[PDB]
């Protein structure tokens, strides 16, 4: 399978999950500004929404949307925690966390709009604080990872999102559970492998 | 199961799917402004995110997020189209459309922010047009419903979203596939039943 990505963007979550699944996969960096694949082709032909991630499962079949991609990868892995049975409450919990990651993403994405006024930015920041506060309340000191004992796809997604906060030099020290979750995720060898594959430290 | 909703909001999609599944269910209207249940209790205890929908599967187990709720309902129905096998490409397509419905929702939701300046509103409207253009391109004249021959959860979700456009007196006539999809969905007896249950025509 071939993952269309941009370094450090939300495609990093499926990149991580592909690495964790042990998945043979390939990687295609996308010029997101010009909407071009690496060979100069039109990325809109791959994803008409023009966003990453996209995952070519096989020639002619490209899945878009992080929730769909993350669960496709999981459902075709041998990692039981990545593929709970539909819906066992576990599947519902998996999808709820992924759904909430999309709420988190929507909040952070305002930060990256062009010609963002200071006033508009303040509103974005307040929303980010609110979403991060909600994430922190959702996480529990009783669980090693978001959903419990096992690392799952929303752990990778949450960690990338929190990563955008760090990269924007935002103070996340009031969200210690979220920071600890990301610390745990980044320590994983197959996570470090994915980072390395995007030329990231 | 008990669905927490607000009349006409995104909770209408799971309301519809509950009706279509034949599901026995109950309904709890939420004062979204004050974040209160009907008995005056604190809605944040039901959904700490403070949003609808939420679905009590049983006492003590409340699922939030439309993608999770819509698939939980489907997976516990007898409607095969609502529960493709994980991931058969059909499951991935289901989740991709639901993921995109969340992109659509995020665009429309800007329209309902308080103290929305005209200038800010123009930006929201341009995003809505872009998301609707993407939806229209995703739909195919070869398919009776979004994903093919069968009505599925994203049909209900898309129809509610387009409904917000109508209610805001927005011109959607440039999206004939989207309008036809909504027309088809609204004609369904179990959809009309759900509308009736929220006191809607
Ligand atoms: N609903 C999301 C949307 C993905 C998205 O907005 N991705 C961003 C990168 S994090 C993007 O490619 N934006 C388009 C752009 O930056 O030009 C999903 O889960 O796939
Ligand atoms: N990620 C969404 C978020 C749901 C959402 O934002 N719902 C709106 C209603 S359409 C809401 O209850 N907003 C809170 C409010 O209006 O105070 C989901 O799929 O459940």
Swiss-Prot record, chains A, B:
It holds the Pfam family GST_C. Residues 87-201 form the GST C-terminal domain. Its EC number is 2.5.1.18. It catalyses: RX + glutathione = an S-substituted glutathione + a halide anion + H(+). GO terms for molecular function: glutathione transferase activity. The keyword Cytoplasm applies. Gene3D superfamilies: 1.20.1050.10, Glutaredoxin. Glutathione binds at residues 10, 35, 52, 65-66, 102-105. Residues 1-81 form the GST N-terminal domain. One of its GO terms (cellular component) is cytoplasm. Its main location: cytoplasm. It is found in: Cytoplasm. The keyword Transferase applies. It is an enzyme of class 2 (transferase). Transmembrane segments: none annotated. Homodimer. PANTHER family: GLUTATHIONE S-TRANSFERASE GSTA, GLUTATHIONE S-TRANSFERASE-RELATED. Conjugation of reduced glutathione to a wide number of exogenous and endogenous hydrophobic electrophiles. Belongs to the GST superfamily. Beta family. This is Glutathione S-transferase. The gene is gst.
């Amino acid at each position: 399978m071939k993952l269309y990505y941009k370094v450090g963007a939300c495609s990093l979550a499926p990149h991580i999950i592909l690495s964790e699944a042990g998945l043979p996969y390939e990687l295609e960096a996308v010029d997101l500004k010009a909407k071009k694949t690496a060979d100069g082709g039109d990325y809109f032909a791959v994803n008409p929404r023009g966003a990453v991630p996209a995952l070519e499962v096989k020639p002619g079949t490209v899945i878009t949307q992080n929730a769909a991609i993350l669960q496709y990868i999981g459902d075709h892995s041998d990692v039981a925690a990545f593929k709970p049975a539909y819906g066992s409450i576990e599947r519902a919990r998996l999808q709820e966390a992924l759904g909430f990651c999309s709420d988190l993403h929507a909040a952070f994405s305002g930060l990256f709009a062009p010609n963002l006024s200071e006033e508009a930015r303040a509103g974005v920041i307040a929303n980010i604080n609110r979403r991060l506060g909600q994430l922190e309340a959702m996480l529990s000191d009783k669980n090693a990872y978001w959903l419990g004992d096992d690392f799952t796809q929303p752990d990778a997604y949450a960690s990338v999102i929190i990563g955008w906060g760090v990269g924007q030099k935002l103070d996340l020290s009031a969200y210690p559970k979220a920071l600890k979750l990301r610390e745990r995720v980044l320590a994983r060898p197959n996570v470090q492998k994915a980072f390395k594959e995007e030329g990231l430290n």
